């Protein structure tokens, strides 16, 4: 078929997302203190490597696997739920069709919390 | 098309699911105690619910949402990973087939965290 990367407009509509989503996140009260010791401008690029692979495109994932970057942090299931609502907000603010959001949280959350069966 | 549900063999399917799931959930030493106070048949019965509606089925879902359900309880994000982690081993027990219980992760993940975009 087409990838899901190729349908939304391939490495510059994951760019777009990506920008949109760190906004969100970072300007969330809850979840902004995680990121205080974080290389940040690394981060966003390994988000934009993470989503392209996960969505079809060539883009190499040079990052680390989802449960080594995350444990022993004392992130909440709360707070999963706050990072995958901004990212359905940054699909959305980006113009991604409804079912095609749906499409993408269903290929990333449970990347995210490293199931892939 | 075909639900989801229909494909994999209807309510009887479901229903083998969420046993299976259970018995992996409560067999968890990091989890088993988030349940000590619960009703746990009501919680089967719901289970089955969520899922079947979830997965395109005539059955309703008339439980809670789930956020309203998980909050407060101290779930984190490990804990909710380790619970992804055990549905997607239920439904390849059952024999689901490997991209198809891909396709229930992402309907189900999403939605367990309060995302419906
Ligand atoms: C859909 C959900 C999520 C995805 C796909 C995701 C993905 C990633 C990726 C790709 C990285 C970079 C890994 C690397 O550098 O090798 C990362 C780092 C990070 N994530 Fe997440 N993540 C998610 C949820 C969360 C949540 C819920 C938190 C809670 C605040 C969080 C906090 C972090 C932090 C703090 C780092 C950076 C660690 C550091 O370099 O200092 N993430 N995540
Ligand atoms: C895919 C992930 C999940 C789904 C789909 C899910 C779904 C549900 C549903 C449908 C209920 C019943 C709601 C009601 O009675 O109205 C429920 C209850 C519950 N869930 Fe989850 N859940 C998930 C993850 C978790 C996780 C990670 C925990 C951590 C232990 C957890 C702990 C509970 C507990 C303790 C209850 C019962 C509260 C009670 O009646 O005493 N769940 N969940």
């Keep these: 078929p087409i ?8 490495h510059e509509a994951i ?5 949109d989503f ?18 940040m401008s690394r ?15 060539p883009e190499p994932y040079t990052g680390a696997p989802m449960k080594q970057v995350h444990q022993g942090r004392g992130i909440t299931m709360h707070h999963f739920s706050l990072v995958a609502g901004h990212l359905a907000d940054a699909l959305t603010a980006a113009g991604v069709p409804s079912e095609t959001i749906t ?15």
Excluded: H, M
């Design 3 to 10: 990838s899901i990367y190729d349908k939304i407009g391939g």
């Design 43 to 57: 981060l966003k690029g390994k988000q934009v490597e993470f989503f392209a692979a996960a969505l079809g495109g």
């Design 15 to 19: 760019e777009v997302v990506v920008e």
């Design 22 to 39: 760190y906004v969100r996140v970072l300007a969330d009260d809850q979840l902004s203190a995680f990121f205080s010791g974080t290389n």
């Design 103 to 117: 499409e993408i949280l269903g290929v990333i959350a449970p990347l995210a919390v490293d199931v892939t069966s």
